[PDB]
Amino acid sequence: KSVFVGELTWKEYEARVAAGDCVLMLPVGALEQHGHHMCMNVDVLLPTAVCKRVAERIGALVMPGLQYGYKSQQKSGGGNHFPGTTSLDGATLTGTVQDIIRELARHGARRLVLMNGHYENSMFIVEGIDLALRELRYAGIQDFKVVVLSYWDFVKDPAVIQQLYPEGFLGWDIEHGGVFETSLMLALYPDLVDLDRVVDHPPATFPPYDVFPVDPARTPAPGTLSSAKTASREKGELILEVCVQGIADAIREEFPP
Amino acid sequence: KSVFVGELTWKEYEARVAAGDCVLMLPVGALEQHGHHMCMNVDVLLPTAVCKRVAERIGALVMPGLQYGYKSQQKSGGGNHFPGTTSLDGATLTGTVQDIIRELARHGARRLVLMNGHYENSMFIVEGIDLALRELRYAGIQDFKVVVLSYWDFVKDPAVIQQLYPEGFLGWDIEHGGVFETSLMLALYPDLVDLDRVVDHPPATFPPYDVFPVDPARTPAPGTLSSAKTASREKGELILEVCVQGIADAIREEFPP
Amino acid sequence: KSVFVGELTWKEYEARVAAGDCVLMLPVGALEQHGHHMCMNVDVLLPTAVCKRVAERIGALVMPGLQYGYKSQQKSGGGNHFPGTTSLDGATLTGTVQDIIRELARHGARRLVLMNGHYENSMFIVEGIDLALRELRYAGIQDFKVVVLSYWDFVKDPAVIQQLYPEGFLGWDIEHGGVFETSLMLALYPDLVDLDRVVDHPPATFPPYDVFPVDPARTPAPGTLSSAKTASREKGELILEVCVQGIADAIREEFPP
Amino acid sequence: KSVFVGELTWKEYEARVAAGDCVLMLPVGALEQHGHHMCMNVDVLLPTAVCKRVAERIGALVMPGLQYGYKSQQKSGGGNHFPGTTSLDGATLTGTVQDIIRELARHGARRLVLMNGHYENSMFIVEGIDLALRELRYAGIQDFKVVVLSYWDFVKDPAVIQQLYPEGFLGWDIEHGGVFETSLMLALYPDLVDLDRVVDHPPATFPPYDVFPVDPARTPAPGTLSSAKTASREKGELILEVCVQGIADAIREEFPP
Amino acid sequence: KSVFVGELTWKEYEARVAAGDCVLMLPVGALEQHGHHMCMNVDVLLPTAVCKRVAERIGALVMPGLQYGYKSQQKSGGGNHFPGTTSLDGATLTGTVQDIIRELARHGARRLVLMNGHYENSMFIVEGIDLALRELRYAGIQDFKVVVLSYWDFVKDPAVIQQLYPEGFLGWDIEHGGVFETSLMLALYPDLVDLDRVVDHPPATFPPYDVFPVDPARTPAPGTLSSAKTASREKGELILEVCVQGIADAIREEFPP
Amino acid sequence: KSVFVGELTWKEYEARVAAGDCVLMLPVGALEQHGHHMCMNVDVLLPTAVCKRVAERIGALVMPGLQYGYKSQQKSGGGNHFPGTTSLDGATLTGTVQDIIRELARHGARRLVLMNGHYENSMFIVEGIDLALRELRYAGIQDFKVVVLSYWDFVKDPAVIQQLYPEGFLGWDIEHGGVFETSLMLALYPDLVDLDRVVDHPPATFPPYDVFPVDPARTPAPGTLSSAKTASREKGELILEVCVQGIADAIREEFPP
Ligand SMILES: [Zn+2]
Ligand SMILES: [Zn+2]
Ligand SMILES: [Zn+2]
Ligand SMILES: [Zn+2]
Ligand SMILES: [Zn+2]
Ligand SMILES: [Zn+2]
Ligand SMILES: [Zn+2]
Ligand SMILES: [Zn+2]
Ligand SMILES: [Zn+2]
Ligand SMILES: [Zn+2]
Ligand SMILES: [Zn+2]
Ligand SMILES: [Zn+2]
């Protein structure tokens, strides 16, 4: 039986919420350039795939994902000046999260996991949550609980980190279109990756400040912030298992049966 | 080569827009109860499937679909009081459409088809377009053109209508979870439909006025506005060809090579 | 004694609301082109006149009408590119309805009828109502009830239709500046109509999609979607009596004395 | 020929704007308690009557009036806690003015007089004007000019002031439902005033600060801020001519042929 | 011990609010041209200094001041076309006031004095207060009380005015960068005033209407609305004691121990 | 001559902008709990002091600081559930930044540095900039440049870090009210720090996700994320010299004479 709310009937959904401890998960992504070697829906595909696996394991349900995210920033995504990247204004993203929470609460749901897959979304997700919880408190509702996370933050194991970043962990911002996402993509959606098109450049470096309008010259030409040359299906499986396991455990701790 | 923008690299997308007469298509759906016999993501699946087939024929590209639409209304969708239905505020939906158009224009695109699959979305799509076009004018851009349509409106042929509705056509609003959508789903995604679960009630009728708060007694208990008892894969195939051909022709007429 | 809230003192108003069953009515119109033969405030004047007559009959009160409505659409009102037509953004109209409901609830009113005179207003009225009811719910208030209706939906009777359209009725979709509105105006405000200026063109027809920016060629030059050549005072008197009786009956059903 | 835009056809309005120096006027009022002796639509009726007469004299046109205004303040209108008073939020009023100016500009109009009739509207009208003009500048339009005024400010002649206020003028802020408005109503709409119902209390005084939530005990019970006992039709006719003469002259100066 | 909240630890502030009758004060100013002889932060500096002194006397606390206010208007501050003046949109200021009240209420505070130092801010402060009180009412809270005042309104005593203006008083509508503010600045921050740079022009006068876009010719060249030639430290010390005494008394009356 | 815009006359400011290469600096802070040993205006005081020193060195001017910032987050500032912390909504902060940029652009300014002192502000600052630049583009202006920096990113050097943290540096994620801010305060405003009140707890650690509503147990009781026990005036003097030099260099690079 599907773990995707979209694939269930309203009766099936109603029954699952009626059970009393139902956990819902919402993938939050983006449509964003991911270099010469990968497609642009990565940030939707990856958190959605992780939510699916986590849900199967813990008996949770997964909502339709947010397909468009906040504006790409040079230091974490190359910059919003690239073609293809299609971004929302902050208020729009915030409002979407807020509306969704309001509705889940109307259903009787009280447990939500927001799984971010696009670096720049985080603070707008946070504001959406706050505004929704504020409204719930107006109606005397104080038992709606949210867990928010970016799936990569769960990859902390030194042993795993050394494999991926043998030469040093580059930070999750510089991990745009690099070894981490590319490996996952090779494991999950190999037809959407062409490792031979990877432009091997040295990891992007930036000064300690930001400039607007964004200066395109400061982003590597391909749009990637680090090279995915050494990405592998094997690395992807390793990441997948570590993320899925860690997130499941975290959700079980925060939302016990 | 995929017709989905999300499955393209940013270079491939850029090249397609650079060619001069590129048509983009954006499906706009909802997560909404669709009776006891069908899942809740129908309004995303159907227009996305029609977009795909149209795009294949005319050489267009399809953007990631809007997964959440405007609040369900009793006379066209059963009402927003149903569990599962997860709806956005008007401002949110309008803002999403507005942000996407702004970004596509930034890319250099000038031709957009918005294919609606959820009855209640229309006027908020219309406002999103108007506000986006207003902004483009401020920026000196007047050559961005938009076609907006709901795919079912292309099923006009009296003969076809009789094949689908032998007892009479009762309006696209009352076609919520009925013969039309169910037939399309049987043709495209049979695993998401269980015809044996259909509740065969008479078509919903309503007084010539609307009441808020929505009174649940005025909607058939299953949430459908009409019975999909006579839905069939064959009917789905017929609808599909009529919609795809009609829309393809309309787009070719509005956006010639 | 006036049925118009604006013509009452606050004490008279307070006492009427104090009765506990007071029905308030809000006309919602537009300032919109209505052909060569009629003035532009039709969509306010007509629902206001109907409200007045209904209120006289059932003991209700009528609020000052909304004079400006949503952007005219080609298929319903000819399009927002015409001179004279002066339209609000959706958020503005939604906010106006929302504010008025908040205030009426503060007064202690709990029964409201919105009478729409301009097709395009519909969904923004719906959103304004939803947002206002949402706020009342935050205050534990759930007994505020709203009925929304368009006066033309009360001319259902085929026998009435036969009298009004002896040469065959071609539908409500083309009744902008046509027989229906012009006849009502001839009955109520004959000095605001000059039937000799009617341009007797064939009914407007459109493809099953819309284009923005709006193409002016698709609207008949005069701005009307159908000819008012056969309009008459007598037809207007009939429409008036039928609309008033039907609406009075519906309101008494939903809001019993 | 009517001076009201709403009573014109779109063709007549188009020709008047095409003339080149067309002045438009927009009355901005409120629905607000005005004591025991007068109705609640005064702030619409009065500036509308003044606009009509000015328009007749200078060849201008008058737009449908704004019927709902900003929240009544204790020191200028008794307070928004009164029944009947139906007020908009500031953003709503601001947006309404903004939308109307944008549309008038679309028509080709470049001259607008905003005539305020409700003391509390002023700064929200100002913001609406500023936001509209900002937008016009974005579209390369800088020749749109607005004159904004509260009609009572044109009563400056000490001789007139003394006829109305022999014991001394205390200000337009405490003139709510008093001699000025009541006199005008006695001259223009005598059936909407009953002088026998005037409660003759001493003029309201207040400390040099404001308190929220508004405290009802600090407002004279009837809602008036001063007594209308000495109001008269003759005084109303004097006020009317002074305002109409002054405003006409002012507009001729600012918007010359 | 400091009377400024910003200079306290959170524990100190918590304890002060915990005592039960804590009065908080919020200065609301602007960055605005104030002629050739005075600096641009006057409207922040002055209410802050008055708040400090009142707080010392009555045991109140002072919040960080609002540094930016609403757009300068010709008749009160010279106009927003001047350099240096840096103004917020109405919605921005309203939202800022609203957010702060929400947060103070969350701390458990229930007594707030807003001290305005910039004429144009008033109605946006009023709206902010209303929207915050509205939200509190959703939670059943009705004991949050706000006193709003412009500090100059406390210089009322004709005996005082006689002392400050012996040759004759010209009114408050011209006191932008004039005798009142300059004298206060001479007493409090003499280094920020150079009386020798005063441009001695006649008091500004205007017709009973406003024009937008603002016409710079209609404001005296230096930006002041009246001459500060006769300003003095002695006058400033008198204004200061009168304002501080008056406001302390008013606050003690509205917020007793 | 002061480097603060607020302390200049409008003429002095105008002349500085007229010079052609004028750099303006805006401190962006917060009112937020900073432990038992320090006051709550730290995030305003610190960037303001750094801006002052940088401005003195490079000939730049400093605008009035933003005193209120975005909601405190558990992992960076302890969380918004603390008393004293007084936070804005995202939209409010974004709008404030947007309005200020629009106004500076109106003045003719084209070079702006935003110095953030409160981590949580970052993305709202980013959105404010983007929205303001978008509007400038509508108005034909493409030469306005913004540099955004957090002063703490300029203490990069490991040799400086070693000097500042001889018992070992644990990272920037726990530097809320710890050694870094406390040392700077001891150097600049020693009366606002009482080192004896420091609670010497073990550095804060958190799981790889966030929870809302915020669980207070997950923040160290005093509100600090690390102990400032070893903070010193001397450390502060070093931080100050290092930050001022680095920021001055960066600005000269990005905005040369
Ligand atoms: Zn990615
Ligand atoms: Zn991304
Ligand atoms: Zn459907
Ligand atoms: Zn639907
Ligand atoms: Zn009409
Ligand atoms: Zn209409
Ligand atoms: Zn009045
Ligand atoms: Zn009024
Ligand atoms: Zn001032
Ligand atoms: Zn000022
Ligand atoms: Zn800090
Ligand atoms: Zn902070």
mmCIF file with all atom_site columns, C-alpha atoms in Angstrom, chain F residues 125-195:
data_model
loop_
_atom_site.group_PDB
_atom_site.id
_atom_site.type_symbol
_atom_site.label_atom_id
_atom_site.label_alt_id
_atom_site.label_comp_id
_atom_site.label_asym_id
_atom_site.label_entity_id
_atom_site.label_seq_id
_atom_site.pdbx_PDB_ins_code
_atom_site.Cartn_x
_atom_site.Cartn_y
_atom_site.Cartn_z
_atom_site.occupancy
_atom_site.B_iso_or_equiv
_atom_site.pdbx_formal_charge
_atom_site.auth_seq_id
_atom_site.auth_comp_id
_atom_site.auth_asym_id
_atom_site.auth_atom_id
_atom_site.pdbx_PDB_model_num
ATOM 1  C CA . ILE F 1 125 ? 18.109 40.806 4.214   1.00 0.00 ? 125 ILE F CA 1
ATOM 2  C CA . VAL F 1 126 ? 18.742 38.879 0.991   1.00 0.00 ? 126 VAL F CA 1
ATOM 3  C CA . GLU F 1 127 ? 15.079 38.974 -0.032  1.00 0.00 ? 127 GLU F CA 1
ATOM 4  C CA . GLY F 1 128 ? 14.777 42.676 0.806   1.00 0.00 ? 128 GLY F CA 1
ATOM 5  C CA . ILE F 1 129 ? 17.750 43.407 -1.448  1.00 0.00 ? 129 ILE F CA 1
ATOM 6  C CA . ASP F 1 130 ? 16.406 41.337 -4.310  1.00 0.00 ? 130 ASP F CA 1
ATOM 7  C CA . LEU F 1 131 ? 12.984 42.957 -4.181  1.00 0.00 ? 131 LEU F CA 1
ATOM 8  C CA . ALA F 1 132 ? 14.503 46.444 -4.065  1.00 0.00 ? 132 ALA F CA 1
ATOM 9  C CA . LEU F 1 133 ? 16.839 45.725 -6.993  1.00 0.00 ? 133 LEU F CA 1
ATOM 10 C CA . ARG F 1 134 ? 13.924 44.290 -8.935  1.00 0.00 ? 134 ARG F CA 1
ATOM 11 C CA . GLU F 1 135 ? 12.055 47.573 -8.518  1.00 0.00 ? 135 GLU F CA 1
ATOM 12 C CA . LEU F 1 136 ? 15.081 49.651 -9.406  1.00 0.00 ? 136 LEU F CA 1
ATOM 13 C CA . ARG F 1 137 ? 15.318 47.673 -12.628 1.00 0.00 ? 137 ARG F CA 1
ATOM 14 C CA . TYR F 1 138 ? 11.686 48.596 -13.426 1.00 0.00 ? 138 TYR F CA 1
ATOM 15 C CA . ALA F 1 139 ? 12.772 52.206 -13.063 1.00 0.00 ? 139 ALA F CA 1
ATOM 16 C CA . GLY F 1 140 ? 15.792 51.891 -15.364 1.00 0.00 ? 140 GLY F CA 1
ATOM 17 C CA . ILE F 1 141 ? 18.357 51.721 -12.542 1.00 0.00 ? 141 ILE F CA 1
ATOM 18 C CA . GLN F 1 142 ? 20.939 48.929 -12.783 1.00 0.00 ? 142 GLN F CA 1
ATOM 19 C CA . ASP F 1 143 ? 23.950 50.559 -11.079 1.00 0.00 ? 143 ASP F CA 1
ATOM 20 C CA . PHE F 1 144 ? 22.903 50.236 -7.434  1.00 0.00 ? 144 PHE F CA 1
ATOM 21 C CA . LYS F 1 145 ? 25.282 47.766 -5.736  1.00 0.00 ? 145 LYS F CA 1
ATOM 22 C CA . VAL F 1 146 ? 24.948 46.103 -2.342  1.00 0.00 ? 146 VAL F CA 1
ATOM 23 C CA . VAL F 1 147 ? 27.564 44.324 -0.265  1.00 0.00 ? 147 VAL F CA 1
ATOM 24 C CA . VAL F 1 148 ? 26.274 42.178 2.628   1.00 0.00 ? 148 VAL F CA 1
ATOM 25 C CA . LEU F 1 149 ? 28.569 40.983 5.396   1.00 0.00 ? 149 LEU F CA 1
ATOM 26 C CA . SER F 1 150 ? 28.522 39.716 8.950   1.00 0.00 ? 150 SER F CA 1
ATOM 27 C CA . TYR F 1 151 ? 31.405 41.215 10.834  1.00 0.00 ? 151 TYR F CA 1
ATOM 28 C CA . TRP F 1 152 ? 32.389 37.855 12.411  1.00 0.00 ? 152 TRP F CA 1
ATOM 29 C CA . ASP F 1 153 ? 33.385 36.374 9.007   1.00 0.00 ? 153 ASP F CA 1
ATOM 30 C CA . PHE F 1 154 ? 36.441 38.651 9.099   1.00 0.00 ? 154 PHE F CA 1
ATOM 31 C CA . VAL F 1 155 ? 38.134 36.916 12.016  1.00 0.00 ? 155 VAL F CA 1
ATOM 32 C CA . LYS F 1 156 ? 39.239 34.122 9.675   1.00 0.00 ? 156 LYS F CA 1
ATOM 33 C CA . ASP F 1 157 ? 42.927 33.885 10.355  1.00 0.00 ? 157 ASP F CA 1
ATOM 34 C CA . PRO F 1 158 ? 43.885 30.800 12.374  1.00 0.00 ? 158 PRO F CA 1
ATOM 35 C CA . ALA F 1 159 ? 46.680 32.825 13.993  1.00 0.00 ? 159 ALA F CA 1
ATOM 36 C CA . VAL F 1 160 ? 44.103 35.283 15.339  1.00 0.00 ? 160 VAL F CA 1
ATOM 37 C CA . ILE F 1 161 ? 41.815 32.425 16.376  1.00 0.00 ? 161 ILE F CA 1
ATOM 38 C CA . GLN F 1 162 ? 44.685 30.734 18.252  1.00 0.00 ? 162 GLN F CA 1
ATOM 39 C CA . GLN F 1 163 ? 45.383 33.980 20.068  1.00 0.00 ? 163 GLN F CA 1
ATOM 40 C CA . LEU F 1 164 ? 41.711 34.378 20.902  1.00 0.00 ? 164 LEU F CA 1
ATOM 41 C CA . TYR F 1 165 ? 41.076 30.733 21.767  1.00 0.00 ? 165 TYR F CA 1
ATOM 42 C CA . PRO F 1 166 ? 44.219 29.143 23.310  1.00 0.00 ? 166 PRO F CA 1
ATOM 43 C CA . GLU F 1 167 ? 42.266 26.335 25.027  1.00 0.00 ? 167 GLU F CA 1
ATOM 44 C CA . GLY F 1 168 ? 40.898 25.497 21.564  1.00 0.00 ? 168 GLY F CA 1
ATOM 45 C CA . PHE F 1 169 ? 38.144 26.999 19.358  1.00 0.00 ? 169 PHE F CA 1
ATOM 46 C CA . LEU F 1 170 ? 34.872 25.038 19.278  1.00 0.00 ? 170 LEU F CA 1
ATOM 47 C CA . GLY F 1 171 ? 33.241 26.792 16.298  1.00 0.00 ? 171 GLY F CA 1
ATOM 48 C CA . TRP F 1 172 ? 31.048 29.718 15.340  1.00 0.00 ? 172 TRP F CA 1
ATOM 49 C CA . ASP F 1 173 ? 27.722 27.903 15.797  1.00 0.00 ? 173 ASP F CA 1
ATOM 50 C CA . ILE F 1 174 ? 27.866 28.343 19.596  1.00 0.00 ? 174 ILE F CA 1
ATOM 51 C CA . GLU F 1 175 ? 29.065 31.958 19.674  1.00 0.00 ? 175 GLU F CA 1
ATOM 52 C CA . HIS F 1 176 ? 25.843 33.519 20.964  1.00 0.00 ? 176 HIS F CA 1
ATOM 53 C CA . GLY F 1 177 ? 26.729 35.378 24.118  1.00 0.00 ? 177 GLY F CA 1
ATOM 54 C CA . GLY F 1 178 ? 30.051 33.571 24.321  1.00 0.00 ? 178 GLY F CA 1
ATOM 55 C CA . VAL F 1 179 ? 33.668 34.667 24.190  1.00 0.00 ? 179 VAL F CA 1
ATOM 56 C CA . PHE F 1 180 ? 33.494 36.542 20.884  1.00 0.00 ? 180 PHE F CA 1
ATOM 57 C CA . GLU F 1 181 ? 30.570 38.903 21.571  1.00 0.00 ? 181 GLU F CA 1
ATOM 58 C CA . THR F 1 182 ? 31.369 39.241 25.264  1.00 0.00 ? 182 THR F CA 1
ATOM 59 C CA . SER F 1 183 ? 35.009 40.202 24.591  1.00 0.00 ? 183 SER F CA 1
ATOM 60 C CA . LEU F 1 184 ? 33.904 42.817 22.031  1.00 0.00 ? 184 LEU F CA 1
ATOM 61 C CA . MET F 1 185 ? 31.446 44.236 24.579  1.00 0.00 ? 185 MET F CA 1
ATOM 62 C CA . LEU F 1 186 ? 34.151 44.343 27.319  1.00 0.00 ? 186 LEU F CA 1
ATOM 63 C CA . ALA F 1 187 ? 36.303 46.357 24.941  1.00 0.00 ? 187 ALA F CA 1
ATOM 64 C CA . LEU F 1 188 ? 33.554 48.786 23.825  1.00 0.00 ? 188 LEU F CA 1
ATOM 65 C CA . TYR F 1 189 ? 30.887 48.956 26.529  1.00 0.00 ? 189 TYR F CA 1
ATOM 66 C CA . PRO F 1 190 ? 32.277 47.390 29.736  1.00 0.00 ? 190 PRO F CA 1
ATOM 67 C CA . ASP F 1 191 ? 29.465 48.790 31.896  1.00 0.00 ? 191 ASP F CA 1
ATOM 68 C CA . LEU F 1 192 ? 27.036 46.583 29.933  1.00 0.00 ? 192 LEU F CA 1
ATOM 69 C CA . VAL F 1 193 ? 28.803 43.353 30.873  1.00 0.00 ? 193 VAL F CA 1
ATOM 70 C CA . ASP F 1 194 ? 29.054 41.728 34.308  1.00 0.00 ? 194 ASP F CA 1
ATOM 71 C CA . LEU F 1 195 ? 31.440 38.815 33.820  1.00 0.00 ? 195 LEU F CA 1
#
